[PDB]
Amino acid sequence: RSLKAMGEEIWKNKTEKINTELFTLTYGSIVAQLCQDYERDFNKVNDHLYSMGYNIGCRLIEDFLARTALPRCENLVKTSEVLSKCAFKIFLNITPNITNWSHNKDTFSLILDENPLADFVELPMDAMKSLWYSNILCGVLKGSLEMVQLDCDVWFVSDILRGDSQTEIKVKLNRILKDEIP
Amino acid sequence: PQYFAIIGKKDNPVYEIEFTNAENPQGFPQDLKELNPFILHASLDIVEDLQWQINPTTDNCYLGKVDHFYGLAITAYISYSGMKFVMIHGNSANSSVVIDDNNMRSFYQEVHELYVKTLMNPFYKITDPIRSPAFDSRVRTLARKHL
Amino acid sequence: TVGPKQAITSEASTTYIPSRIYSESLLFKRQEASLSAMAFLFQEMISQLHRTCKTAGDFETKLSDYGHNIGIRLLELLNFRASVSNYITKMRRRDLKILDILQFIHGTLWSYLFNHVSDDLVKSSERDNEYMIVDNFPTLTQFIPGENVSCEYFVCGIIKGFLFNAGFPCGVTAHRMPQGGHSQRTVYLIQFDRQVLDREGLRF
Amino acid sequence: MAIETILVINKSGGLIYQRNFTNDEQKLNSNEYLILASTLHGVFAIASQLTPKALQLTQNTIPYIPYVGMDDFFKEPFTNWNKSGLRQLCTDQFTMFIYQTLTGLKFVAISSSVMNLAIQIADNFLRKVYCLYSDYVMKDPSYSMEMPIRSNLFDEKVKKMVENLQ
Amino acid sequence: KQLFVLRLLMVALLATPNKIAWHPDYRTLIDTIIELLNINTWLILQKKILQLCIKVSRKINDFEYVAKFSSILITKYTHLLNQSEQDALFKEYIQPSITNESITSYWDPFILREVVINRILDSDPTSNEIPAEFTCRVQNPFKFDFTINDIQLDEEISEFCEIDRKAVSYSGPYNVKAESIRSITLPLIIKKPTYKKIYEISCLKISILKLPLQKFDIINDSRR
C-alpha cells in the first residue's frame, strides 16, 4: 500500500540477487581503464561516465516501470519519495533519504549514507580534486528522469572518498509540459 | 635491526623499510648500503626454488629461515599472488628467529592482510611501488608490537 | 612520501605511536544487488567496446583484459577469506597442482561470483593440457542472441586472470556447444603452454 | 482472450516488431504494417482528443490478477497509464487489444476471438509481454534505440507465452 | 647467487692496492655481468652493478667502456642519480671521455622545444608584398632549448641550420642551465632571395662541445 512497505515485497519477488562486490569490481575495472587510456585527464572521465549513465538510465526506466507499475509523480516530492524508497531500493540495496530543499521546492539533495558502489576504493592523489568516483548514477538520474520528461540536471557537491564528510547529489528540474496523450 | 621487503614476480620491490632498535641509533654498520640489497636478491633464487616443491627441507604460505649467511637470519613468506615477503635479521651476535615464529608468522599474516587491502584498490595496479604513508604507519606499529 | 624508487629509510623501532587515519574490515558483510543492474553495466561495457573497436579479435582481447583486472585482484581476496584478520587465522594450502586450482575455481569462485556452484569440470581425452570448464546457463550473458560468442569472453578473461597471476600461465577461448535442453552451454577451454607442463613433468 | 497476432510499435514512429504466428497460412506483411502502425499512432491522439461531457473523476482504473500465463511476474492488482485513450477495437472477425506504457510505448495484440474481463486478461498479458520486452531487448547491447527487434531469444520467449495461454 | 659471487670477485678486485693490465677475461666478465641482469625490473641493483663496472673499467684503463656504460647510465637519468652528488662523478667519468673518442650524439634527442621564426618589422609603409607560411622579411628569428640532467656545463657551440637556404648564424659559445629552459638569444638569419615554393624543415644542427651532430628533432610531433 505504502511504497516504503512494498519495495521490500519487490525485494523478495523477481529480483534475482547477485553479489555487490562483483558489481564494485567491474565498475572499478571500468573506471581504472578509463583513467588509464585518457592519459590521466580526469575531467573528461566524469563526462564519459555521464555518457555511459545516460544510456544506462534511458533503458533502465522501462524495466523499473515494468517491474513495478506506478502512476506519474504528481509533485516532485513524490519523485523524491520514489527515488528514496523504491528506485534505489529495488535495484541496489540502499535506502537514501531526502534533505536540503530549495525554498521554492525546485531543488532537492539526496544524502546517501553509504555507497555500495565503492567499498575498497582509494583514489590517487592527483585525481583528488577533479574526479567524482561514482558519477554513473548521475547519468542514470538524468536518463530515467529524462524519459518521464522531468527535464532535470544532475550534479555532485561532495563525497566521502574525496575527504568530505558526506555523499549527496543535488538535482533540480527545469520544465516538463510533455507526456503521453492518453 | 631488520630490513623488510616485498618483491614482485619480475624481481622488483614494491615495499622496502629498515627498522632498528633505539640503542643503536645508527643501524647495520656499512652493510646497509651495499650488502643488504644483494643478499636479498640472492635469497630470491632459493625462495623461487622452494615455491614449487611439496615437502620442504605444510601449507606453503609461510616457511622458516631460508639461509644463514654472515650471521644473518633471512626469513621469507610467499603470498597467494606470488609476492615474496623476505625480511632479514641482523645483530652484533647470532640471532634466534625460530622462537619468534609464534609472533612473526602472525606479523606476516596481517601484513598480508594489509597487502590485500592495498591490492583491492582498482587504481593500484601491480608493478607499482606502494607509495602510501598510511601503510608505513601500520607496518611500523606492527614492527613495534611484534618485536 | 615513504617509499620511492630511490632509497630506503631507517627509523627506530619502539618509538611513538603515529596518527590513525583509514581502516576497514576485510571480511565480507553479505550484500546483495539485482541482476538487472549488473546486466545493464555489462551491456554498457560491451556497447562501449563495440563503439571504440574495429574488428572482433582485439575486442575479445580488450574484454579479456577487463576480466583479467578482476581476476588478479580476486585471487588473494578469496584465498585470504577462505583462510580466515585480527582474529587468529591459519593460512590455506596455497595449492600448486593444476588439478586443484581448477577444483578451487569450480568450488569457490563460481559460488562466490554467483549463488550457484559451477556445474561440470572434465579433462580432454584427445590431448593433454586441455581442460573443459562448463556450465549449463551463463548468468552474465543470457540477454544477447546466442550466435555471438565474443561477449562471453569477459568471464574467461577472469579465469586467465585467475590463472596467470597464480603461477600457471595459460590461454583461454570460449565456444558454445548446444547440448541437450540447454541451448547455450558455453564451454571455456584452457590452453596451457609447454613450459608449465614439463615443470610438473619434472615433479614426477 | 485468445491471442493470435502480435505487434509492437514505436513510441514515435513506425513499428519495431510484428508476428502473424499461429495462423498456419501466408498473409501479406510487407510495408502495409508500417502504414497501419502509423495510423494507430495518429488515431490514438485523435481518440484522446475528443471529450464527452463527463467532467467528473475516477470515482477505479485498476484491474486485479487472474494468474495468466504458464511464479508469475506480479502478485497484486496494479494501475494503468491510459486513462483517456483507445483500449480495444471490436469487429466481426477480430478484436484488437492495445496497451500502452507510460514512456509512450504501445503494444498491440490482434485477437481472432469474436465478441470487460477480456480487458483484464488482455492488460495482464500485455503487461507481461512488456516485462519480457524490458528483460530481453533493453538489456541487449547490440539493440540500438528505436530499431526493429532482431533478438531470436525474444521470439521463443513470447511463442511459449502464447502457447501457454491456450 | 652467481650474480652475487661475480659481484664479490669484482669488488675484491676493486680494493687491491696493486695495478693490473688489460686482459680479455675482464672483457667477458664485463659482458656477462651486464648481460646477467636483463639490462639490454629492479633499477637500484642495476645502478649498483654498473657503478662498480665503471670503476673497474677505469682501473683497467679502457675508456671505451667507461664511455659506453656512462651512456648506459643515461637511461636512469631522471631519478635515482641525486642532485649533482652522484651526477658529479657522472661528470668526472664523462669529461675525459668527451676529451677522447666518446663522440656519440649527446645521450638523447629530446632537447629542442618548438622554436618560433617570427620577424619584427618597424615600418607600416612596407607590409607583405605578394601577388602556416611565414612571409619573412629583413629581421631576425628566435630559438629556445633545454636540458634535463642535474649536471652543469652543458655547452652548446655553433648552432646552425640544415641543407636549407643561406640562413646562417653568428656565434653561440655560451652556457645553458641545468634543470630549466634557457632561451638561447638571437641567431640572426641573413636570408637570400630564392623561389616561392615551400618546404618545411625538421630541425637544426647543434654541437655539445663536439663536432656538430645530427638533427635532435622537435618533441611530440615534427612541429613543422
Residue C1 lies inside a defined structural domain of this protein: no
In a domain, C104, yes or no: yes
Q: Which amino acid is at C177?
A: M
Contacts of C32 in chain A (CB under 8 A): 17-20, 93
If contacts are CB pairs under 8 Å, which of residues 98-137 in chain C contact chain E?
Answer: none
Q: Cβ contacts of residue C120 below 8 Å, gap of 6+?
A: C132, C134, C135
Resolution for this PDB entry, in angstroms: 3.7
Å between B17 CA and nearest CA of chain C: 6
3-state secondary structure chain E: CHHHHHHHHHHHHHCCCCCCCCCHHHHHHHHHHHHHCCCCCCCHHHHHHHHHHHHHHHHCCCHHHHHHHHHHHHHHCCCCCCCCCHHHHHHHCCHHHHCCCCCCCCCCCCCECCCECCCCCCCCCCCCCCCCCCCCCCCCCECCECCCCCCCCEEEEEEECCCCCCCCCCCCCCEECCCCCCCCCCCCCCCCCCCCCCCCCCCCEEEECCCCCCCCCCCCCCCC
Among B52, B35, B147, smallest CA distance to B63 is for B52
**b/e per residue, E90-116, with b = 16+ CB within 10 A?**
bbebbeebbeeebeeebbeeebbbebe
Judge B/E contact: 3 or more CB pairs < 8 A.
yes
Question: How many Å apart are CA B105 and CA B80, to the nearest integer?
Answer: 15
Is residue C3 within 8 A of residue B133, CB to CB? The reply is no
CA separation, residue E60 to residues A173, E15, E20, E64, E152 (Å): 81, 13, 7, 11, 28
Pick from B7, B80, B86, B119 the residue to mutate for testing the C interface (most C CBs within 10 Å): B80
Write out the H or E segment, with its range, that includes residue A63.
helix A42-67
The DSSP letter of residue C164 is G
C-alpha dihedral, B136 to B138 to B140 to B145, nearest 10°: -170
Phi and psi, residue C34, nearest 5°:
-70, 155
Chains linked to D by 3 or more Cβ pairs within 8 Å: A, C
Decide: D and B in contact? Rule: 3+ Cβ pairs under 8 Å. Answer: no
Identify the bridge partners of residue C181 per DSSP, sorted by sequence position: none
The reply to whether C165 touches chain B by the CB within 8 Å rule is yes
Q: Which three cell numbers stand for residue C159?
A: 579465469
- The answer to the question of residue C197 being in a domain is yes
User: For residue D39, with 0-12 CB atoms within 10 Å meaning exposed, 13-18 middle and 19 or more buried, which class applies?
Assistant: exposed
Give the side-chain half-sphere CA count within 13 A for C85.
10
Chain A positions touching B123 (Cβ under 8 A) are 32, 35, 121-124
Q: Do the Cβ atoms of C69 and A33 come within 8 Å?
A: yes
CA dihedral E96, E98, E100, E103 (to 10 degrees): 160
For chain D, give the number of residues. Answer: 166
Beta pairing partners, C59: none
Counted domains in chain C: 1
Closest by Cα among B1, B13, B3 to B84:
B13
State CA E121 to chain mean position distance.
Answer: 36
Sign of CA dihedral C115, C119, C124, C128: positive
Rounded to a whole number of angstroms, the distance from the CA of A12 to the nearest CA of chain C is: 11
Interface of C with A in 2-31 (CB under 8 A): 22, 24, 28, 31
Contacts C4 to E, Cβ<8 Å? 79
- Give the three cell numbers for residue D111: 485477437
Rounded-to-integer distance, Cα A102 and Cα A109, Å: 9
Where does residue A118 rank: exposed (0-12), middle (13-18), buried (19+ CB within 10 A)? Answer: buried
Domain count, chain B: 1
Report the residue of C23, C24, C31, C139 to disrupt the A interface, i.e. the one with the largest count of A CBs within 10 Å.
C31
CA A5 to chain centre: 21
> How many residues does this entry show for chain E?
224
β-bridge mates for residue C134, sequence order: C120
Residue pair C191/C171 in contact by the 8 Å Cβ criterion: yes
Burial class from Cβ neighbours inside 10 Å (0-12, 13-18, 19+) for residue A80 reads: buried
Interface of B with C in 4-23 (CB under 8 A): 14-22
Of E68, E53, E62, E71, residue with least CA distance to E13: E53
Q: Which of residues 101-130 of B touch A (CB under 8 A)?
A: 117, 120-125
Parent domain of C132: 31-204
Name residues whose C-beta falls within 8 Å of residue A89's C-beta, 6 or more positions apart in sequence: A7, A8, A11, A95
Cβ atoms of residues E51 and E87 within 8 Å: no
Closest residue on chain D to C47 (Cα): D141
CB contact under 8 A, D141 and C36: no
